């Protein structure tokens, strides 16, 4: 699994479940092409977005729909979404774990990059 | 000053100086329109991006060039940039302070909204 | 002002007002000695904790009463408090700003050390 | 496993490996009694600190030796340690995952609390 995303809720102290996210890859013309999408599980994780063969070198963007998540909980949050834009596999193939911690007016994102 | 951005460096424990950022506003046609830009001062702050008259309700994006910042320091970063996308809403008088804390492989952002 | 503490609320997007905190200094016998204390202002800041003459090198602890803050807001928190333990070191003139960002189940702290 | 700790390094984008930590429990006289300790694995995790029978209600403190971690990497960090002080199992038994993200001048801690 080359790309995994984990989302946590800092208000409830729990995984952020059923959070939608969309992954895009930058094309040669500088436009964002849809690449993959899914929703976090009961553990706040989203696995299986891509495969080693499909996840080629490039610039990727993960847009996490945090606004719909907070709205479902009765909160009007500050951000429209939480994101990560990064270059993947430019110095060889890697496994990427993107972790996001959510609050109504704040978010943090971190990456764990390991050699397969 | 209705919009202020402050950027901190979690590696050096200091303000993040000379960090470039661009602000965009989403137009009725769903496109991002350039709105303002600048670079952080010696205090890690960027003031004067907009005025009360110009800063109307809408969806705004602040793209912070974190990658060039880390490259200038000789540190290999993860993110291409740090985005902050938010709706500006009139609900009494409001001023927005966007604070970003930067690390090579992580960033955090918060908003302080005051009256 | 050699030591300043700023506290922000990530749920309300505002300064964290009337937050109590106690500062301790580790003495030669390994015990924690009370050093200073106060409550954050309407701007979420606590200034005037110490002076340049009093703030010598040593190991200091700032215990922020986050639990009472969340309880006052009717939100069930995780942490009893947020500690910040650090060494103050003379390496040219220095001023310390401790910034804490609070959520019910999480907190972040950073230091901005300037000359 | 009622208590698990995960530590990440925000400078290298990796798990924080071989990080020492000590867990204390507050006694009736308000003093901190040593409870458990260990070091994070190659995955930045520390499992098996306690058992369901031993992990009774109380106030606990996890002190993570972040200073020795940064010093081993050639960095003189700001904090002496990263910590979490919390009341455990006061409203029934729970499983606690403490996550810490480390930078030389900053740290973040979050808890994921789930019902067994």
Author numbering:
A (entry chain B), D (entry chain B): 10 to 125
B (entry chain A), C (entry chain A): 10 to 124
Authors' account:
Transthyretin (TTR)3 is a 55-kDa protein that aggregates into amyloid fibrils under pathological conditions. In its native tetrameric conformation, TTR transports retinol-binding protein and thyroxine (T4) in the blood and cerebrospinal fluid. Amyloid aggregation of TTR occurs by dissociation of tetrameric TTR into monomers; these partially unfold into amyloidogenic intermediates and self-associate into soluble oligomers and amyloid aggregates. Here we identify two segments of TTR that drive protein aggregation by self-association and formation of steric zipper spines of amyloid fibrils.
Familial amyloidotic polyneuropathy is caused by a number of TTR mutations, including L55P and V30M, which we examine here. Familial point mutations are known to destabilize the tetramer, leading to faster dissociation and consequent amyloid aggregation. The combination was also effective at blocking aggregation of the familial mutants V30M and L55P at physiological TTR concentration. Also our computations with ZipperDB show that TTR familial mutations do not increase the propensity of fibril formation (data not shown). These results support the hypothesis that familial point mutations destabilize the quaternary structure rather than creating new amyloidogenic segments.
